[PDB]
Amino acid sequence: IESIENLEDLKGHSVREWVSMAGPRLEIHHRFKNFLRTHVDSHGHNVFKERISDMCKENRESLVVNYEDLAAREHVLAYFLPEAPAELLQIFDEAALEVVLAMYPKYDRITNHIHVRISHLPLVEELRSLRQLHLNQLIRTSGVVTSCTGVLPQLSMVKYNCNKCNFVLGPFCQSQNQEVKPGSCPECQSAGPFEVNMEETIYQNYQRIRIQESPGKVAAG
Amino acid sequence: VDLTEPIISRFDILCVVRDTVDPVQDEMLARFVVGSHVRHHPSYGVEPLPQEVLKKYIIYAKERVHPKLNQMDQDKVAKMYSDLRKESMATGSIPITVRHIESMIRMAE
């Protein structure tokens, strides 16, 4: 894959498919790795060396990136980030894992994924002002948390025992949209009462919160 | 005050603020207030910290630091508490109970 000297020329694509295809994906990956490795603050201190070191000291599995720093240092990543946030956040997580395992080669024992979190995004929105124009875009809102579920286990990559034979169905990704139905067993074609393999299934923490407008920002009555 | 002894004794520090006339202090207070209204327009001697620095200092002092008491010269505080109890019984101004001793330890920490 040749390095792409200009990510900015979409050449008629939209941002989502443009960053989904391999060339721009690798270019974004390398640009984010270089950003993490070489970004320095106003005093010349490498901020992300310190941040990754603190994260690995405390086993926290998550890396907060300042959007102001990203926009200042690497423009096109900040350009594509709010347009295709899921795709670029996946790529950023991969790149951050590469940098983290460069710094701490044994951190795979503690984690298998690094979550890149974005802070100080200028795209601030009021809850009353969210429209269909903001769909599938990275927004920033404010409010008071009024409800919280308990921390619940959710399927992320689920495996199913076949209802008759001993085969196990392949990894199916959970989507947040609907229940994943296994289909039919490829060994024998049965499609009966399948059951989750708890030991081979990968779970993730889930918590659904309800936020509302803060009572001092809502109008009286 | 109209409050009662069980709630009065639960307050470690008990402050009285009065608004009595004193012309020199009134002049200095007026100059400070008008200067504040000038300073904060939309546009003691010792100097304070910036409030951001103070917030960082506070959370560091509260979470990363933990005082430990080795000694506190028990005779001094014990005699103080004993005759503070005597004068409180004399005037009736404030109940002193046992909580004021532990307030001393807390304020030192």
Binding site: S53, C56, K57, E58, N59, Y104, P105, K106, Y107, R109, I110 | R64, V65, K68, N70, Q71
Partner: protein
């Protein structure tokens, strides 16, 4: 005089007789006592055993028992004083002296009839010749000879230190008798490890003595065992280990071990608020999860443990701790009982120096002596719990001293003082625990301070002892350089200061560098010490 052959001139003599053991309160003394007890119990030697915690109670016990016994054995006491003058014995008693303290008193060396020294002749010994020490122009040369005697004898008596372990001496006796059981070899190992843990010997000498003990370990491990015939799990197996320097780390969490080991606590400066982040950086460099590190070692995941020692060494080398490994030994028996020699040392030492007020110091001696036999494994595990408490209290006290800056450089020597009523001072009131505290605190101070001058000084520490008589225990420690030969002058400096000031100094502990002092005289005593060391 020195006993040339322990079998012929000591053991075969006392084998036919009633014997009285005076045993000092330290783990090496306890181990030598265990070995000698085992030999005497094999041969039906009707002995009596008396613990002695100091010179005055040794004198009291001798006054009580001198009528009934003609043969006495002193374990880790007596060699460094004139026993004839101290005890005033009858003309026909015999004192066998198995003692690590050096230099041996010249009267003890050149007494040829009554004092018999169970000391290896190849130890670090340089005794002055007899004619240099013992008996107009003729009387002028007599006075000149006396002046030369004072010079030579000061040069001899200046530096106090420790020789070969008494437990190792008694094990060599057991080997010559060919009644050396595997538990006797373990007790010898524990005595040498007591010397090493308390820093009474140099690392070179410790490595040499470990090299000696390795061959005995191999012999015992091939008495009835090889790669294809093996014994029951009941039998004891002693193994040579190139293990970690961490303290008790197989009996509590690796986190507690790193926090309460003197070396790593001093290096990471964990008394300071900032040092915990240094330790977390070390653990992250290793790649150990903090939950696993804080879990108990026996409950830690086994995938983390089977290369942990070399992982520790590899990370320590790039952190600048170039010697995290140590040549040591371990003992296994049954299915679950496993101890490092350091673990047994710390457990027995804690049982001796326990902070409990119930009973007495002799009762605590008895608990420690019982814990060295495998019929009292419950006592050994209780001692391990007490050792965890003792190590934690040691680190809290070091943190208090360094944070409050009680360690002040008094020119020739650093000075520190514990205060009455402050935490754990009653635990550290006993001289052995106080010596360990002062050594650990000096290492912590040397790692803490940035001044090049302060890293080379010795340290004097005081602590309260008495209020019914108003006295303090004072200890002197040499510098903590890696070049150090583990010799100190404070035993003689203290008495020179005490006689220069006519201070009320009392000298009960078997080490000259530990004294009792009236609380009022410490000011002029310290003034004389600054004047003397100059």
């Amino acid at each position: 005089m020195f006993v040339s052959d322990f079998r012929k001139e000591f053991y075969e003599v006392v084998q036919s007789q009633r014997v009285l053991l005076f045993v000092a309160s330290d783990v090496d003394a306890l181990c030598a006592c265990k070995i000698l007890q085992a030999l005497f119990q094999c041969d039906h030697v009707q002995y009596t055993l008396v613990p002695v915690s100091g010179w005055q109670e040794l004198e009291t016990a001798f006054l009580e028992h001198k009528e009934q016994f003609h043969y006495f054995i002193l374990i880790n006491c007596g060699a460094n004083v004139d026993l004839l003058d101290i005890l005033q014995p009858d003309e026909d008693t015999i004192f066998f002296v198995c003692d690590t303290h050096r230099p041996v008193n010249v009267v003890n060396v050149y007494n040829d009839t009554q004092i018999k020294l169970l000391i290896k002749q190849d130890d670090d010994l340089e005794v002055p010749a007899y004619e240099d020490i013992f008996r107009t122009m003729r009387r002028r040369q007599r006075r000149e000879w006396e002046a030369r005697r004072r010079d030579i004898l000061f040069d001899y008596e200046q530096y106090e230190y420790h020789g070969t372990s008494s437990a190792m001496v008694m094990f060599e006796l057991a080997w010559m008798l060919s009644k050396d059981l595997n538990d006797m070899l373990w007790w010898a190992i524990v005595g040498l490890t007591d010397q090493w843990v308390q820093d009474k010997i140099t690392q070179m000498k410790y490595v040499t003595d470990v090299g000696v003990l390795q061959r005995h370990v191999s012999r015992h491990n091939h008495r009835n065992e090889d790669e294809e015939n093996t014994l029951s799990v009941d039998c004891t197996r002693i193994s040579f280990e190139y293990d970690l320097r961490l303290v008790l780390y197989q009996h509590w969490s690796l986190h507690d071990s790193l926090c309460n080991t003197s070396y790593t606590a001093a290096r990471f400066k964990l008394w300071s608020v900032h040092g915990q982040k240094r330790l977390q950086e070390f653990l992250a460099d290793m790649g150990l999860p903090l939950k696993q590190v804080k879990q108990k070692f026996q409950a830690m995941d086994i995938s983390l443990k089977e290369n942990l020692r070399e992982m520790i060494e590899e990370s320590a080398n790039k952190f600048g701790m170039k010697d995290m490994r140590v040549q040591t030994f371990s003992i296994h028996f049954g299915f679950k009982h496993k101890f490092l020699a350091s673990d047994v040392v710390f457990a027995t030492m804690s049982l001796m120096e326990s902070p409990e007020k119930d009973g007495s110091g002799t009762d605590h001696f008895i608990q420690a002596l019982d814990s060295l036999s495998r019929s009292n494994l419950d006592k050994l595990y209780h001692g391990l719990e007490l050792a965890k408490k003792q190590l934690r209290a040691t680190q809290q006290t070091i943190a208090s001293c360094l944070c409050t800056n009680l360690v002040i450089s008094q020119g020739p020597f650093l000075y520190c003082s514990l205060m009455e009523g402050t935490p754990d001072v009653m635990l550290f009131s006993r001289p052995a625990s106080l010596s360990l505290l002062s050594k650990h605190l000096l290492k912590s101070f040397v790692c803490s301070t940035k001044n090049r001058r302060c890293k080379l000084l010795p340290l004097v520490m005081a602590a309260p002892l008495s209020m019914e008589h108003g006295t303090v225990t004072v200890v002197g420690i040499p510098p903590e350089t890696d070049s150090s030969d583990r010799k100190n002058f404070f035993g003689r400096a203290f008495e020179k200061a005490a006689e220069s000031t006519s201070s009320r100094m009392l000298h009960n502990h078997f080490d000259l560098s530990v004294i009792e002092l009236k609380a009022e005289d410490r000011s002029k005593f310290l003034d004389a010490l600054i004047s003397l060391l100059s």
